[PDB]
């Protein structure tokens, strides 16, 4: 037995019942909880965890009620550190348009000395699920529709958080969330019934969180939604035969916020004792916020409506996490010395916008630029029109963690800074980000999240008209306000806002070269802007640091580089749009009426998986296997060339599909299977080298058997899902 | 059993090429030229015909079986989907009737007209749920609700199939499509469908399994994949499924060109593996791709496929051909050699009474402010909009032998019920499409849109003009025909463009609007709501549409139709229907906080739910009250409420009772349909309902798919609508 199990099975010898249950706690200070009976609590031994308590002052004091129990077990502290601390980097989705794991990683990295030197020890984070339903609001969190990206994503920053050694001060854990299926909610609708098939359950929506469990993730948060009928946090298929006992997770494993009393409003408990036995038998350790573990476990047990063995499991879950974190050796690793001076949580010194400058230009996304309009040369009189110009709350996204709105630098003053004084800047705001009077009491009903300009639509627009006349071009700054892509802000409209798509027609009318500068959490219906804009941005929510990084981009100090991981539906009604779907009996060719369509729009994406643009030109050579035929055990290479063929240097995202075009169940058209992103300067080349063997090739049938087919598979390699090159082999 | 010693009789006689050609199922086209068939039958290579629909074209097919070695006779099949040649409602709409009686007299006619034309099956009824408005299909079920659409998959098979397949009078029911193809994801047509196993059970398969257990004697196997596997090629589906578990005897017949597209599917790389995967996964006969006849023998001599394979599929023809009655008399649906001729159109061979009864059933009141409707027959009626005259439309999609130029228009109607009392004037208004590249996709293949030449501008001054010689507006406005049909997905469910420019015209002008729906799909009405002053919706209602909504418009029928799918507020929240779960954060009336399962940017909930529909008179339910508060296992009980006609005019409502599960070992939907009643009431008549309930209703698959009824509450709620309940609880011990 390791010193760990040694360790643990020595103190649970040592425990009764209620500290054992009191592990299982985890709360935050609120209107549930007030600090001082939180504090009395700690001190008698019934808490195991706290939540949402940020700074180093407030997490010392309550690690120093530990001492009061009679074991002193330590606290852990946790946080929503999603994308950022302190410093915020951009939301996920953007994060994951770089297509570059140590770009990934290093916002990860930030992010956990960030919470840690706060005294925090893990993060509710990395967010993995699947997206392919553009109306879910919690889209943002994730990395898009794909599984490889996504699930390599997943690893990476799994590993990021948690270092070489989770006792390290500025290592967090990491739970890995929503498990699972989160983002398939049926209509887009926060927290709705998800329904799928185990095939596509395996081979699509469930590798992230295996690959988070497989880096070494120390938790894993339990999600709001049914699974087939089966809440997640009442699932033992889903929480111990499938995360336990087929992966081999050893973790901690968290319910979500209420999530346990929820069981009742699901319909799978009419009482909080059922709801709390359905829990803890099904494989939830740890009990957030609502207190039904410490309430009604001494009952189920004295019953024998539980066995011991579920409250020891849990309990050993918990100890066991905070032993890996250090916090058994020393209580305070992350919380400095008793002797150490105050200081400013929130101090200008403790942020990282060096970090988050460089990784929010990896992210930017040029969906559109027409006659080499971008880059800008610094000159001439630039109109900044919109809602979002000048933006401090939306820049850093929703689940912006600890980050200061005052702190971020807003799309104008990005290009303030840019141009100093060679090129003069107009401002006016144009709109406000809805016209609807019931979306903006929406939008401001908790706190004051949106600027609501007192003028008229009308005003508004006169002005943003009269100071587009005076100007040689316009950037206009539009899309969404963080609270529409934000947990329960589901949308039935993937267009701009109403308000601002006026202020775009009216602005277009002025003959003004039209630059568009979009913030969004989510894919964007765009057919007006890409038939009449002259260039357009897609920025996501950049971050403390996003209006600096999209000046870089369109001055051309940054060759834009990134690449949607996530299709971009021409329409609501198109939902769901994704690449690697599967071509039907009747498949529509760009082109018959017979055929799996709309008849009422243009099918496919505005815009596909992949697609980004650049500044420069490349160029790909023709596309060779190594192999027509493939042995099993051996490695097939994919060779091809990549130039330079443009004027600038920059990168670019060569990309693998494969196709299995005969096979037991029907496989998708195409599937990402590796990608390469290459930094080129003019005239140079790279010959890019993947290689594949039979692990790439194999899929989940109808009875779930994981394996690879012999015969063709078809190999695609571009720089988007949509224009590439195709070679075929054999697996014999 | 004579029947199975007459066919193994006749399958001794059988060589391979006889057998194989019992299974070939074909239509006169480019891809069979009709000599060639003629050829092919006196060869014994053709074992059935779609798409063929008059006694002498029929009896000439049957002629070229006597050429043949065994004379084994054809049998015919067509799609009479809601009528032959008199036109009844879309399925939606009669199922909007909620009176299986409506429903079995228009599957009777139906069947009595194509008998009477020779036919001997229809490819009907289709049953397949549907919750995806956008989805084209939708017009040909019953709706969203798997009680009701179990039922009436049951009711429509019954009523085709009388007494005795061999009957004249009868035809064999091709119930379809099996499986799942209304789960269409996208609501694109023939895409991808991807469920759980306990909500295909539960929710989606029931109405196929109604149709075997009335008796269908054929399955039409859909197009679509289910979890990856096309239903063409999935043997669980058509052997485990449909023959181990359910106990079917009948034939499985495949989609038109499915067993080819296996390949497109990814399920074959040529046409000789797709063969052997339908023929092995339970496909008996191939639907005009020819594949069966090119490979079989290749199959079989390669030990690719099984003699029993063959005889399996071959058996399944013979057997429904010796039900329909046609090894004891070929012509038994074709009358006599030496029958005089006669027009097989003939007014005299139409049902329009029974088509004008059953098309007023099926129409629902969605508004009526201040008591417009019923229309006094007096003064100015103006009639504008491009569906107003439409003989095409009326029709709806899959009309079969329908002719368009018998079908009563809107304005017919308006015409024939106010004789000389009142005057009408008509104008088009605009085009029923606005968008170019939409009317060049549904004048696509058949020109079956008439577009007015004039400008979008130049038809709405003229229906202004119009409207302001009137007292009133009857706007005749919706969906053509090809925009809810096949391959007919929608990304928009409004009105069109040009036809919301035009309501929104009238509107200005001051003059009461009544709006007269024609749509083939739940569209989004939220403007129409809250501006016109009536909506009647009428779905494409048949050849006596035009009369039958001319009853309800001027008071002669009480609207009595109520909704039978959720009309969503807009396409962005599909999908929208009433038997959803509850999740662990509602929003309802009673949950409306921000962190709910909800949208942000529109009202939540349909427009209208599930069971919706107004009347003429107002009606009222006394308390419900249960027979007891406890259910023992084996016995039944009983919800009693009295209904009663609360107004001034006679008419019918339906009476709806839904039971919730609230405490389950599944999360269970928040109501589900367990029965209803349609009540007609005279102005104060009372009648007392009774509804039973036992064990059956409140069983449901977990997990594990065991069909289980747990001990523990039951909630039963009585209303007349989904919306408008209220309930009572009981204890299964
Ligand atoms: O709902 C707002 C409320 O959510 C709380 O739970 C979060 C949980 O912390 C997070 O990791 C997960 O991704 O989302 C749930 C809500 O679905 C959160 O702790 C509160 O701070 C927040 O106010
Ligand atoms: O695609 C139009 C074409 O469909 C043919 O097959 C029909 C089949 O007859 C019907 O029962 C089923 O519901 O739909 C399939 C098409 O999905 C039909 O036989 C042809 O007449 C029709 O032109
Ligand atoms: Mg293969
Ligand atoms: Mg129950």
Redesign the pocket.
Same mark, same amino acid.
């Given at each position: 037995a390791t010193d760990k199990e040694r360790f643990i099975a020595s103190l649970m010898a040592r425990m009764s019942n209620a500290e054992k249950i009191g592990q299982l706690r985890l709360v935050?200070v609120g209107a549930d909880h007030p600090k001082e009976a939180l504090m009395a609590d700690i001190r008698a031994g019934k808490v195991g965890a706290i939540? @949402?308590t940020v700074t180093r002052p407030d997490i010392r004091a309550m690690q120093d009620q530990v001492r009061h129990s009679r074991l002193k077990i330590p606290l852990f502290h946790a946080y929503?550190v999603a994308h950022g601390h302190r410093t915020i980097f951009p939301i996920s989705l953007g994060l994951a348009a770089s297509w570059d794991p140590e770009v990934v990683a290093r916002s990860a990295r930030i992010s956990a000395l960030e919470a840690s030197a706060d005294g925090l020890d893990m993060s509710?984070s990395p %967010?993995v699920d699947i997206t392919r339903d553009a109306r879910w609001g919690r889209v943002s969190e994730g990395f898009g529709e794909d599984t490889y990206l996504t699930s390599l994503l997943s690893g990476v920053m799994v590993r990021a958080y948690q270092g070489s050694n989770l006792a390290a001060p500025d290592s967090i854990m990491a739970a890995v969330? #929503?498990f699972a299926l989160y983002g398939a909610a049926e209509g887009g609708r926060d927290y709705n019934t998800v329904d799928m098939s185990l095939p596509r359950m395996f081979q699509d929506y469930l590798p992230p969180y295996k690959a988070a469990v497989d880096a070494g993730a120390g938790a894993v %948060?339990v999600s709001?939604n049914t699974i087939n009928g089966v809440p997640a946090t009442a699932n033992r298929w889903l929480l111990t035969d499938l995360l336990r006992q087929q992966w081999g997770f050893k973790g901690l494993t968290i319910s @979500? #916020?209420g999530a346990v009393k929820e069981l009742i409003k699901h319909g799978l408990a009419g009482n909080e004792r059922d709801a709390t036995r359905l829990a803890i038998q099904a494989g939830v350790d740890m009990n957030m916020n609502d207190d039904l573990y410490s309430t009604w476990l001494p009952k189920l047990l004295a019953a024998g409506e539980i066995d011991q063995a579920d409250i020891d499991r849990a309990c050993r879950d918990v100890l066991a996490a905070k032993y890996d974190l250090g916090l058994f050796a020393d209580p305070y690793r992350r919380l400095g010395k008793p002797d150490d001076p105050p200081f400013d949580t929130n101090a200008e010194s403790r942020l990282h916008r060096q970090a988050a400058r460089e990784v929010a230009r990896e992210g930017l996304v040029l969906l559109k630029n027409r006659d080499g309009l971008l880059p800008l040369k610094k000159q001439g009189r630039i109109a900044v029109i919109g809602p979002l110009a000048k933006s401090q709350r939306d820049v850093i996204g929703s689940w912006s963690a600890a980050g200061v709105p005052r702190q971020a630098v807003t799309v104008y003053q990005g290009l303030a800074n840019a141009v100093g004084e060679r090129a003069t800047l107009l401002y006016a705001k144009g709109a406000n980000v809805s016209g609807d009077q019931a979306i903006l009491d929406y939008l401001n009903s908790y706190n004051p999240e949106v600027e609501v300009d007192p003028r008229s639509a009308e005003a508004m627009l006169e002005e943003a008209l009269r100071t587009a006349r005076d100007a040689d071009l316009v950037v206009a700054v539009v899309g969404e306000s963080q609270g529409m892509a934000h947990?329960a802000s589901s949308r039935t409209d993937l267009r701009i806002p109403a308000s601002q798509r006026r202020l775009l027609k009216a602005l277009k009318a002025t003959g003004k070269p039209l630059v568009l500068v979009l913030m969004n959490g989510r894919p964007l219906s765009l057919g007006w802007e890409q038939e009449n804009a002259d260039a357009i941005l897609e920025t996501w929510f950049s971050g403390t640091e996003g209006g600096n990084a999209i000046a870089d981009v369109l001055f051309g100090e940054h060759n834009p580089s990134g690449k949607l991981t996530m299709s971009f539906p021409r329409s609501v009604g198109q939902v769901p749009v994704y690449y690697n779907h599967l071509n039907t009996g009747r498949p529509m060719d760009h082109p018959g009426k017979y055929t799996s369509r709309y008849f009422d729009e243009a099918n496919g994406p505005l815009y596909p998986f992949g697609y980004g643009l650049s500044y420069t030109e490349f160029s790909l050579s023709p596309l060779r296997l190594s192999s027509e035929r493939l042995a099993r055990g051996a490695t097939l290479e994919a060779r091809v060339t990549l130039s330079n063929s443009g004027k600038r240097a920059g990168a670019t995202v060569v990309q693998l599909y494969l196709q299995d075009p005969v096979a037991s169940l029907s496989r998708p058209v195409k599937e990402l299977r590796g990608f390469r992103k290459v930094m080129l300067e003019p005239g140079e080349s790279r010959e890019i080298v993947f290689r594949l063997g039979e692990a790439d090739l194999k899929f989940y049938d109808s009875q779930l058997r994981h394996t690879a087919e012999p015969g063709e598979f078809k190999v695609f390699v571009g720089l988007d899902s949509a224009q590439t090159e195709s070679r075929s082999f054999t697996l014999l």
């Open positions: 935050s939540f @949402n929503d509710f %967010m969330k #929503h %948060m709001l @979500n #916020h947990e």
